Design goal:
The structure is a homodimer.
Chain A (H helix, E strand, L loop, with lengths): L5 E3 L4 E3 L1 E5 L2 E9 L23 E3 L6 E2 L11 H4 L7 E2 L5 E6 L7 E7 L17 H7 L2 E5 L4 H5 L12 H16 L5 E11 L1 H11 L9 E5 L12 H14 L11 H8 L4 H7 L27 H7 L6 E7 L24 H11 L5 H11 L8 H30 L3 E7 L20 H4 L12 H20 L22 E5 L5 E4 L3 H13 L1
Parallel strand pairs in A: 2-5, 6-7, 9-10, 9-11, 11-12, 12-13, 13-14, 14-15
Antiparallel strand pairs in A: 1-2, 3-4, 4-8, 8-10, 15-16
Helix pairs in contact in A: 10-12, 12-15
The complex binds the ligand CC[N+](CC)(CCCCCn1c(C)cc(=O)n(CCCCC[N+](CC)(CC)Cc2ccccc2[N+](=O)[O-])c1=O)Cc1ccccc1[N+](=O)[O-] (2 copies), 2-acetamido-2-deoxy-beta-D-glucopyranose (NAG) (3 copies) and chloride ion (CL) (15 copies).
């Protein structure tokens, strides 16, 4: 009976498990419920705090994954399957995980809260790439990661109705943050130093906790990796969420008996449908044929988001905020194989000019004819307009800039203009273990392995250079979470990382070579996306 | 008494003058009338062939300059004054000049016909930069240059009328070309090798002789230097020419007193106006505040131009044609000091961003609001949007690319696609003797000094390197006129000047350094001007 693995929180006693990290033991508490299961008549509704329990509740193991669509495109392929659920799917998914050094730290340790991505349609904190034993052991951090509801279950909304108010997955996240506030001191964490960091939709979620006043008192510093609250895919209007919800209900046969305009009857009918009945029709409600669009995402309800994210970042007061943002080299690459015809992971995806034009219509689905013409003009090389290599790479660049890079640049420019301290990176290193094809470069979400320190595991067959690289990145992130600055205090000789500013526009490259400072994150192109195309 | 200077043409006998070129004598016949003077009742009317004369006509001096505006902006400044009329101004201007070697050539010599520029409001063949003695002495060419009516006197049009059909300055040029066809064998020229070459409006004129079918039997090869028949400034619609002509008539106090109506009466009244009255009022009729816009230019009458120049170059068959086209480094440089505020030749001309926006509204005067926004987007550097130097150069680039470079790129592309043999250049060398300020670079029309071989004159204080440069350029031009190819027929690894094609898009740089082959003349930017921008 180990006294370090027995911890009492508000709700009751917890039993953890001692895990072996490469450099020493860590304490893990996995599957701590922070909310009553959102099942039955709780579906689509905001979460309620987990009722206290009796005896010792077992957290030695990851709990179930929130119910979600599962990626079937390339069965058996490590590239997709690494992101697929590694546990049972259930609507009783609201649980969080805690990693602490062994033993508990003598003094309160800054806390890191990871919010996973997946486009608000998928993901779990039990995935191997989110393993927090390396950060906890090496940098002494207390790392928390929670499961939140995704897809319809988290985001199906009938705006204005009480039964399906929308954004309840964000409310799951917020409840996990309040749980960290109340209970994290018992694990050795400091509730007064709390850094949220996330990738893809998780990153967007982080931004939204910045823009929602009730969430601002639950965290101090924030990191957005390859995602933003603003931009094309991360939010939907009230009317659009009503359209998608009503259409999905229509596909599952809801409501019955003469239909009507009763919202309580529609959501009452939906709450009796098996989860998979909803997931079956999840993708059918997208308004246009598209990639990098997700059916059920945060809605602008005038509640959790008091206004649109763009308006909130434009007019906000960010004076006391410290943000770290960045992108990867090719953000849009693998999205192309998800239904832009001519693109596959098993060949070079050399495409014709017509295939590139159609690809623009899919990858920028909300673009008008004139806006698509502008995108084609901008991304075409008119010395080699037919060159299939440049057409393919330029398609990847269109998707990546549109959905990620340019929204990140917009967010960093706005936050820096409004008084925030912003740090910007671009992750250029392709993992030696990557199973995706060569032409896709560094794809969406492939920096996460190194931030969490997976290369420090020698059994994972990384390179030694990737091990020291991962250690350096863990130093950057942990330094940021601790001091609000990624640079190592005192030090120097280790070229400094300047803050991103409006005048200088300085960002750094994260790769095997030492830190290289650059100016102008896709400056001309993102001026086109962020400035011109709106006028069209 | 000189046996070489007495020459008989179809109209009568003429006696020329022996001139001293730096390396030997040449024969000059200057002021040969090719047309009955377009004076009195013949104003605005097409030219009539010069009726035969008695005696020996004096060829030894330049004749009058066509009545035209005189540049007052910078009095005493060589930069502007070198283009001003150097002879008496008169409405009886129609005369041409012939240069041949001394003695006159034994066997028929390929003929070069120069059509001067000046935006169809100005110019003359008597200017020092158009002096043909160097091409006659050094390269043995027979060079002809003619005066044609400019301004109201050649281009004022009431389309469809008998009394002022429009384009009579172009008909002046054509009549000179027909005269050359009949009479040039008397001077030793070869009527079956005739190369038109011109600059600015002259270049445009050349292009229109290509697109006008009656002019097609008077020449073989063409050279267009910094001008095109297509594009914003070189043509006006029938209705616009009628609008400008009627407005001018009313401004000179010539309705007479009701409005308008009978075109015989409007033109009859307009013919009673002093020449300087017309010149005084000619700039009043420009529809918007603008630079690089000229009031009276060729009109699309459905007669000389069967269709718009863009239409004719898109649908034409050029299969037997040989064209040489090119631009200079900064085309729009000195247009900016003509009333874009903030631009003068006496300072570094560093401008603010607001001055750049207004400057785009002036330099692209027919652009809509959205089109101007697009121009400002494209030409702004978004790493240094406020940098005054980049904004000044960018303003120059807007005017240059809009009026010259991109029209040349469209013409080159269309002629190449439809089967012409196209050679393309970019003139990068700034004359050491240039009086315009440093920031203007190589301005509009400053390659002509070198093409005509003026640096071979030692009194003009050029460099030796510019002597060699001028010689090399004269060899390219006369090689093209002779063979339809600029390249030295007997040579290898000079290197070679390749023909412009749609696939390769190869052009050469003309400067002090040896020929450098480049691809993609203003490829992306002119893709913006020619392809996208129209759709707004
Ligand atoms: C239509 C087939 C249905 N569809 C459509 C569409 C569309 O965009 N997608 C999703 C494609 C995204 C890439 C797939 N994942 C694996 C499941 C990356 C390898 C998901 C992912 C992982 C990590 C972060 C973010 C994501 N993400 O954005 O989806 C589609 O399936
Ligand atoms: C008293 C002056 N007014 C009344 C008659 C007229 C003002 C003169 C016109 C000013 N202007 C404008 C407004 C636009 C424009 O594009 N240009 C052409 C100038 C380009 C350069 C001129 N040159 C030297 C002579 C080059 C150095 C000639 C040249 C040489 C070789 C190739 C090509 C050229 N070229 O193309 O010109 C221009 O001159 C006053 C008045 C009255 C009513 C309305 C407006 C005015 N005003 O605006 O001044
Ligand atoms: C919706 O249905 C419930 C139960 O059938 C009913 O009590 C309620 O009045 C209905 N709402 C409306 C607006 O008809
Ligand atoms: C690559 O594979 C995809 C799917 O198998 C196919 O649609 C595409 O035509 C292929 N591309 C090439 C260049 O063979
Ligand atoms: C123009 O005016 C004259 C006046 O002598 C008149 O005879 C003639 O018919 C008029 N032309 C037209 C087309 O009306
Ligand atoms: Cl283990
Ligand atoms: Cl269980
Ligand atoms: Cl949006
Ligand atoms: Cl196209
Ligand atoms: Cl769009
Ligand atoms: Cl690009
Ligand atoms: Cl008369
Ligand atoms: Cl002869
Ligand atoms: Cl036009
Ligand atoms: Cl019109
Ligand atoms: Cl601006
Ligand atoms: Cl653009
Ligand atoms: Cl540019
Ligand atoms: Cl074109
Ligand atoms: Cl310059």
């Amino acid at each position: 009976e180990d006294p370090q693995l027995l911890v009492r929180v508000r709700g009751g006693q917890l039993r953890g498990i001692r895990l072996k990290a490469p450099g020493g033991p860590v304490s893990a508490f996995l599957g701590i419920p922070f909310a009553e299961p959102p099942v039955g008549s709780r579906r689509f509704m905001p979460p309620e705090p987990k009722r206290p329990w009796s005896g010792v509740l077992d957290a030695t193991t990851f709990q179930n994954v929130c119910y979600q669509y599962v990626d079937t495109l390339y069965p058996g392929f490590e590239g997709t399957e690494m992101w697929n659920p590694n546990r049972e799917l259930s609507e009783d998914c609201l649980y969080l995980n805690v990693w602490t050094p062994y033993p508990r730290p003598a003094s309160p340790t800054p806390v890191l809260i990871w919010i996973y991505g997946g486009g608000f349609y998928s993901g779990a904190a039990s995935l191997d790439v989110y393993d927090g034993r390396f950060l906890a052991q090496v940098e002494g951090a207390v790392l928390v990661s929670m499961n939140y509801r995704v897809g319809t279950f988290g985001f199906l909304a009938l705006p204005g109705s009480r039964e399906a108010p929308g954004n309840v997955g964000l409310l799951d996240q917020r409840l996990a943050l309040q749980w960290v506030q109340e209970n994290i001191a018992a694990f050795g964490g400091d509730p007064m130093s709390v850094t949220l960091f996330g990738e893809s939709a998780g990153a967007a979620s982080v931004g939204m906790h910045i823009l929602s006043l009730p969430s601002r008192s639950l965290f101090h510093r924030a990191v957005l990796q390859s995602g933003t609250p603003n931009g094309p895919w991360a939010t939907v209007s009230a009317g659009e969420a009503r359209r998608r919800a009503t259409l999905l209900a229509r596909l599952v046969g809801c409501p019955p008996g003469g239909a009507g305009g009763n919202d309580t009857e529609l959501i009452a009918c939906l709450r009796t449908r098996p989860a998979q009945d909803l997931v079956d029709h999840e993708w059918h409600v997208l308004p246009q044929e598209s990639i990098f669009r997700f059916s059920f995402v945060p809605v602008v309800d005038g509640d959790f988001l008091s206004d649109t994210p763009e308006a909130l970042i434009n007019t906000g007061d960010f004076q006391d905020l410290q943000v770290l943002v960045g992108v990867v080299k090719d953000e849009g690459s693998y999205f192309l194989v998800y239904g832009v015809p001519g693109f596959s992971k098993d060949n070079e995806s050399l495409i014709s000019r017509a295939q590139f034009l159609a690809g623009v219509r899919i990858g920028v689905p909300q673009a008008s004819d004139l806006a698509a013409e502008a995108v084609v003009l901008h991304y075409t090389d008119w010395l080699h307009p037919e060159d299939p290599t440049h057409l393919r790479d330029a398609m990847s660049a269109v998707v990546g800039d549109h959905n990620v890079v340019c929204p990140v640049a917009q967010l960093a420019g706005r936050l820096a203009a409004q008084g925030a301290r912003v740090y910007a990176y671009i992750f250029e290193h392709r993992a030696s273990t990557l199973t995706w094809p060569l032409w896709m470069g560094v794809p969406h979400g492939y920096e996460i392995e190194f931030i969490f320190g997976l290369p420090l595991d020698p059994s994972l067959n990384y390179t030694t250079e990737e091990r020291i690289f991962a250690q350096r990145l863990m130093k950057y992130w942990t330094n940021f979470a601790r001091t609000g600055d990624p640079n190592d205090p005192r030090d120097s000789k280790s070229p400094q990382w300047p803050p991103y500013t409006t005048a200088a526009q300085q960002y750094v490259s994260l790769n095997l070579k030492p830190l290289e400072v650059r100016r102008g994150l896709r400056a001309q192109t993102c001026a086109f996306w962020n400035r011109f195309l709106p006028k069209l």
